Amino acid sequence: SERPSDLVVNRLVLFVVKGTATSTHDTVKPLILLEELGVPHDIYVVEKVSAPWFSEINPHKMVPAILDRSPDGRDTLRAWESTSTLMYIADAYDKDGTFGGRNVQERSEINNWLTLHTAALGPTAKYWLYFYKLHPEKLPKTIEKLRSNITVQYDILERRLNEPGQQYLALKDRPTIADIATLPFAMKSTAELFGLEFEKWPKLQEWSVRMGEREAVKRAWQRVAGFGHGEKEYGMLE
Amino acid sequence: SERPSDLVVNRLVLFVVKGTATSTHDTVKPLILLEELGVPHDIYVVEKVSAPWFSEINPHKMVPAILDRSPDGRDTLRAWESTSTLMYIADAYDKDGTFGGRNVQERSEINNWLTLHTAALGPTAKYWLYFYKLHPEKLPKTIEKLRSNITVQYDILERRLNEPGQQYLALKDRPTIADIATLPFAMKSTAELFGLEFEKWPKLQEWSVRMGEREAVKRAWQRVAGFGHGEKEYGMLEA
Ligand SMILES: [Cl-]
Ligand code: NA
């Protein structure tokens, strides 16, 4: 339907919701990359993701979502699903491939570890959270199986980070969109939410701290928590 | 670990298992794109995905997986997760971006619909199949919720294919890796396996038929069924 009056696309617009402990694990992903690359962007706090105008941007009716001017300015582009928002930002703004990958060999590993998160840990974690908190009935056997699957995903990330010189998931030398996608679901606070001892994956914990010490990541976590708690509650932030 | 004697990487090697109705819906995806682009490749039929040598290729211990030579031909690289195998094959072999997308605009929509399948329909369908067939105990409330989530994904795809001129999921004009990734989980036979009536999503059904009519798609479906049922059951198949 008709867009809100304050929704204008002069630059990349990242769509988020009010910052809470449970609302920021996916929206933080594109924000980390925007902060890493220093991309000019606006923040739009969505009051209701069920709103018809928003389903025209993201048919899956969730944040994060992006509206942006196409390189030639002929079209308004959109990105939705948190992994797709990372792919878009990398494609449009990371022309060096510092986070997207510079060659076929780099991208091969980046896309392996990015897709592993997109297909396995990400959806498993979101099904765990749904059945644990959101489902009207509690199904403990389903929850236990999903928690078990999370430990297997942590085992895989741990095995990778135990390989000689492998400081990051995809590339030995530097973090990539694979690392950004994985971090919010592979840190101590999220491990504790799942009822897991994160010290049981030492190389994964080290990696999460290494990622956490990055200035862009610190800025992203600060800002995503604050969205919708400033002077403006909903709509285009200033 | 120790590789099997017959595993050599002289070109792209696609790792599959013995063809059944429920063993081919992810392995067929890279095979469709290989057939579309006419990429030279070998097929390796894995007997046990639990084999230590295989986990060195794919730590997730599943098919599809790819071993291939690097562009220069000095080194060997790998792709695993079906979506990743599509991204790799497009990156290495689809230089025109016929299926990968030719510009930032095309790739924005290709990645939206590809990631929707990778994150939503794909994992939901796999968890449905797991709880329905593989889990030692049948959990009908879990299976029903997953089946319900599949109908929501079908609703999203139907909405997209009801938009004016939108013949394919990502692009209006031609199919992409987004369409290839989606097809095996959005076709009549799969809809019947889930216990759904696929005619409830008319534009989605028409799209699945349009995709199914493509020669490359037919060849991949025909080939993926036969892997491990020929004169060689497991290991590197003979062309
Ligand atoms: Cl249960
Ligand atoms: Na049609």
Residues in chain B: 239
Place of tokens 């004697």: B5
Tokens of B8: 């050599």
- Of A128, A87, A137, whose CA–CA distance to B101 is shortest? A87
For residue A102, give how far its alpha carbon lies from the nearest alpha carbon of chain B (Å). 12
Supply A89's token pair: 């930002």
A163: left (phi over 0), alpha (psi -120 to 50) or beta: beta
Contact A108 B79 (CB under 8 A): yes
Sheet harboring A65-69: ordered strands across?
A76-80, A65-69, A12-16, A41-45, A235-236
> Residue B173 belongs to a domain with what CATH number?
1.20.1050.10
C-alpha–C-alpha distance, residues A106 and A148, integer Å: 31
Residue A116 and residue B141: Cβ atoms within 8 Å?
no
Contact A79, A65 (CB under 8 A): yes
DSSP run (H or E) holding A162: none
CA angle, B201 then B206 then B210, to 5°: 145
Residues of B in contact with A135 (CB under 8 A): 145
Contacts for B109 with CB less than 8 Å, ≥ 6 apart: A78, B101, B170, B171, B178
Verify whether the Cβ–Cβ distance A80 to B124 is below 8 Å: no
- Core vs surface per residue B105-136: b (16+ CB within 10 A) or e: bbbbbbbbbbbbbbbbbbbbbbbbbebbeebe
Residue B43 class from Cβ within 10 Å (0-12 exposed, 13-18 middle, 19+ buried)?
A: buried
Q: What are phi and psi of A194, to 5 degrees?
A: -80, -10
Sign of the torsion formed by the C-alpha atoms of A21, B108, A71 and A37: positive
- What H or E segment, with its residue span, contains residue B90? helix B82-93
User: Strand pairing partners for A236?
Assistant: A44
Q: Indicate yes or no: CB of A80 within 8 angstroms of CB of B104.
A: no
- In sequence order, which residues have a C-beta less than 8 Å from that of residue A112 and are 6 or more positions away? A170, A178, B78, B79, B80, B81, B84
**CA atoms of A11 and A9, how far apart (whole Å):** 5
C-alpha distances (whole Å) from B186 to each of A120, B182, B204 are 20, 6, 7
- Classify residue A104 by burial, with Cβ atoms within 10 Å: 0-12, 13-18, 19+: middle
A80, β-bridge pairs: A65
* CA-to-CA separations, B115 to A115, A118, B94, in angstroms, rounded: 9, 7, 19
| A160 vs A225: CA distance, rounded Å | 31
**Chain A contact present for B209, CB below 8 A:** no
Evaluate the omega torsion of the peptide bond into residue A64 and state whether it is cis, within 30 degrees of 0. Answer: yes
Q: Which residue from B77, B104, B120 is facing A108, i.e. has the nearest CB?
A: B77
Any residues with CB less than 8 A from the CB of B134 and at least 6 apart, and which?
Answer: none
* Angstrom distance (rounded) from CA A222 to CA A85: 20
Yes or no: say if A20 and A27 are a contact pair by the CB < 8 Å rule: no
Phi, psi (5° rounding) for residue A65?
A: -140, 155
The CA-based angle B222-B223-B226, given to 5 degrees, is: 95
Place of tokens 């932030």: A237
What is the token pair recorded at B19?
């063809």
CB B104 within 8 A of CB A66: no
User: A234: buried, middle or exposed (CB in 10 Å: 19+, 13-18, 0-12)?
Assistant: middle
Chain B: residue nearest A75 by CA?
B105
Q: CA A47 to CA B41: how far, in whole Å?
A: 50
Asked if B108 and A80 come within 8 Å (Cβ–Cβ), the reply is no
Quick check: bond before B64 cis, omega within 30?
A: yes
B86, B92 Cβ separation under 8 angstroms: no
Q: Would an 8 Å CB–CB cutoff place B72 in contact with chain A?
A: no
Closest-approaching ligand to the CA atom of A137: 1
State this model's resolution in angstroms: 2.0
Structure tokens at B185: 């989980």
Distance to chain A for B237, nearest Cα, Å: 25
- Is A60 close to B105, i.e. CB distance below 8 A? no
Q: How far is the CA of A147 from the centre of ligand 1 (A)?
A: 13
* Polymer length in residues for chain A: 238
Residue A199 structural domain? 104-216
Using DSSP bridges, classify how beta strands B65-69 and A235-236 pair: parallel, antiparallel or unpaired: unpaired
Could you give the count of Cα atoms lying within 13 Å of B111 in the half-sphere of its Cβ? Answer: 30
Burial (CB count within 10 angstroms: exposed 0-12, middle 13-18, buried 19+), residue B69: middle
- Within 8 A of B114 by CB-CB distance, chain A residues are 84
B176 contacts: CB under 8 Å, gap ≥ 6: B99, B100, B101, B106, B110, B113, B114, B168, B169, B170
Report the alpha-carbon distance of residue A200 to residue A189 in Å, rounded. 14
B167 touches chain A (CB under 8 A): no
* HSE, side-chain direction, 13 A CA sphere, residue A48: 5
| Interface check B139 vs A, CB under 8 A | yes
Contacts B144 to A, Cβ<8 Å: none
Burial of B39 (0-12, 13-18, 19+ CB in 10 A): middle
Q: In Å, what is the CA distance from B3 to each residue of A125, B8, B119, B236?
A: 33, 9, 32, 12
CB atoms within 10 A of CB A40: 9
On chain B, the residues whose CB falls within 8 A of the CB of A77 are 104-105, 108
C-alpha span between B160 and B167 (Å, rounded): 9
User: Which residues does chain B have within 8 Å of residue A60's beta carbon, measured at their own beta carbons?
Assistant: 116, 120, 156
Q: How far, in Å, are A4, A110, A161, A163, B172 from residue A98 at the CA level? A: 35, 11, 20, 22, 32
User: Over the range A163-184, which residues count as b (16 or more CB within 10 Å of their CB) and which as e?
Assistant: eeeeebbbbeeebbbbbbbbbb
- Check if the beta carbon of residue A55 is closer than 8 Å to that of residue A61: yes
**Do B145 and A135 make contact, defined as CB atoms within 8 angstroms?**
yes
Say how far apart CA B78 and CA A63 lie, in whole Å: 32
Residue of A68, A82, A113, A118 for testing the chain B interface, max B β-carbons within 10 Å: A118
B22 at A interface, C-beta within 8 A: no
Contact A84, B115 (CB under 8 A): yes
Q: Are A237 and A227 in contact (CB under 8 A)?
A: yes
